[PDB]
Amino acid sequence: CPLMVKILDAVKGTPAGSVALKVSQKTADGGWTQIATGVTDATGEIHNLITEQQFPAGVYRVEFDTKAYWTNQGSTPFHEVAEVVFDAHPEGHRHYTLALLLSPFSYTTTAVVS
Amino acid sequence: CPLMVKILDAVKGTPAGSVALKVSQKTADGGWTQIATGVTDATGEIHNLITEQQFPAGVYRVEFDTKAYWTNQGSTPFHEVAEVVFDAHPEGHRHYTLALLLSPFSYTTTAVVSS
Amino acid sequence: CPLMVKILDAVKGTPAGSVALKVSQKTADGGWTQIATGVTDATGEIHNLITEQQFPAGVYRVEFDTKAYWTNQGSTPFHEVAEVVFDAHPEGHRHYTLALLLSPFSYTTTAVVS
Amino acid sequence: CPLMVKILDAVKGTPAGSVALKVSQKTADGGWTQIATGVTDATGEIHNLITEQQFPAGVYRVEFDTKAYWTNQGSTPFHEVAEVVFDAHPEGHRHYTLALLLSPFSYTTTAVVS
Numbered sequence: 147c148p149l150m151v152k153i154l155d156a157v158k159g160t161p162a163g164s165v166a167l168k169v170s171q172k173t174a175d176g177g178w179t180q181i182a183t184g185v186t187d188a189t190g191e192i193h194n195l196i197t198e199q200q201f202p203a204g205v206y207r208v209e210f211d212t213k214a215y216w217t218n219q220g221s222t223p224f225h226e227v228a229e230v231v232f233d234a235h236p237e238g239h240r241h242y243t244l245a246l247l248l249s250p251f252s253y254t255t256t257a258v259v260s
Numbered sequence: 261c262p263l264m265v266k267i268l269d270a271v272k273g274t275p276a277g278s279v280a281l282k283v284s285q286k287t288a289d290g291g292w293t294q295i296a297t298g299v300t301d302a303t304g305e306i307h308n309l310i311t312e313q314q315f316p317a318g319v320y321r322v323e324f325d326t327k328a329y330w331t332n333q334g335s336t337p338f339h340e341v342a343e344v345v346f347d348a349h350p351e352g353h354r355h356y357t358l359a360l361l362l363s364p365f366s367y368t369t370t371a372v373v374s375s
Numbered sequence: 376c377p378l379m380v381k382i383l384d385a386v387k388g389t390p391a392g393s394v395a396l397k398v399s400q401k402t403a404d405g406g407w408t409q410i411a412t413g414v415t416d417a418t419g420e421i422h423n424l425i426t427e428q429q430f431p432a433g434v435y436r437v438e439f440d441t442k443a444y445w446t447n448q449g450s451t452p453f454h455e456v457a458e459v460v461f462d463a464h465p466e467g468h469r470h471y472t473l474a475l476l477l478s479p480f481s482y483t484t485t486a487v488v489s
Numbered sequence: 490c491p492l493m494v495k496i497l498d499a500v501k502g503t504p505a506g507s508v509a510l511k512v513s514q515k516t517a518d519g520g521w522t523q524i525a526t527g528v529t530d531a532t533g534e535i536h537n538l539i540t541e542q543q544f545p546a547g548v549y550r551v552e553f554d555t556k557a558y559w560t561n562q563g564s565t566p567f568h569e570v571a572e573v574v575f576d577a578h579p580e581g582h583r584h585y586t587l588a589l590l591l592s593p594f595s596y597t598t599t600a601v602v603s
């Protein structure tokens with residue numbers, strides 16, 4: 147699994163379950179095109195989010211639907227979305243874990259690359 | 261000024277000076293219209309980034325060129341860019357401060373919103 | 376004002392008012408001596424917490440009562456306290472700002488040094 | 490194990506390997522008693538840091554030697570140490586995971602409880 151996520155809820159002290167996300171690829175032209183979607187399970191993770199064949203070198207954007215998550219928790223969020231934009235396999239294939247720490251008016255995006 | 265930023269560098273323990281950013285406004289069709297650009301000063305701020313009149317209610321996107329910042333600092337960063345997207349309702353002298361804390365492989369974005 | 380703080384609330388998107396904190400100075404024998412206490416105003420700051428004369432070089436500890444901050448809002452927090460421990464002026468006098476970003480189960484502590 | 494840690498390096502984008510830490514239990518007299526030491530493996534973790542027998546309800550301190558970590562990485566750090574203090578099993582017994590995101594001048598401490 148070349149692309150993994152781990153989302154934590156800083157209000158409740160649990161993983162953030164049922165967070166919807168979208169994975170897009172940047173075109174040669176210059177825009178975005180959506181290639182996969184997923185929803186986190188109760189551990190804040192998504193297994194088999196994409197295949198290694200869907201994940202060639204290039205720039206990708208992962209859009210986390212934090213607004214819906216907080217709304218479904220009964221809280222008022224600030225951000226309309228949380229976007230993580232990165233160049234993948236710039237100099238050699240490897241595995242990516244996007245860690246995301248959520249609060250209604252704040253998030254922290256970190257990356258663990260192996 | 262209804263929209264301020266504060267950017268800090270978590271490696272050096274200073275504000276992040278000379279960071280370029282773009283402010284865009286979501287249009288009715290769902291695209292984006294650029295409405296301002298700026299570069300942080302040595303305190304990590306941009307004074308008078310936009311006027312009250314340029315900042316009506318709606319969705320905005322603030323795009324911070326952190327890649328260039330880290331490259332110039334001599335570190336190889338993870339993120340191509342940092343984007344903060346939010347719905348503004350700037351009724352009643354309601355001000356937004358976007359705080360951003362930068363690390364080469366991490367950032368934290370928070371907002372402070374007045375009343 | 377060599378020692379300043381800026382505390383923010385990541386749940387509601389405001390500065391964290393009425394946060395009590397204590398400043399202690401490490402002693403030769405390894406112990407801690409309290410030198411100042413204070414409470415953040417509504418901007419999340421404390422003015423005139425200590426003087427330059429009270430702030431010689433050495434190890435300090437700033438203890439933030441985050442538990443009461445969350446308890447008094449009716450939320451349930453994780454940490455008993457937030458403690459920021461640092462060596463001050465190890466290469467000369469400076470000015471120190473401790474920024475603190477608070478959520479019930481998380482905080483981020485950063486320093487701005489001049 | 491009832492107490493796990495996960496330490497990430499936000500400069501390199503990897504787990505923080507070989508971080509030393511100490512676990513202490515607050516005593517009735519307001520002091521601290523050390524109950525364990527440990528050192529993270531290359532995944533930023535410590536397997537079996539303590540046992541259930543060592544973990545009655547009460548306040549605990551986990552002290553992470555982050556200064557030595559950054560010194561070895563060849564960076565100049567701000568904090569002397571990173572300290573996490575929390576009340577364990579306040580409303581009954583729980584399992585705890587402490588997440589720590591490290592930068593030379595910043596850290597984020599988060600908790601995942603049960």
Ligand SMILES: Oc1nc(Cl)c(Cl)cc1Cl
Pocket residue numbers: 152243245246258495497586588601
């Ligand atoms: O298992 C985990 N992994 C990561 Cl990467 C984080 Cl940030 C937090 C936890 Cl609990």
Ligand SMILES: Oc1nc(Cl)c(Cl)cc1Cl
Pocket residue numbers: 266357359372381383472474475487
């Ligand atoms: O004025 C400010 N200063 C600092 Cl240091 C932070 Cl983190 C946030 C704000 Cl709004």
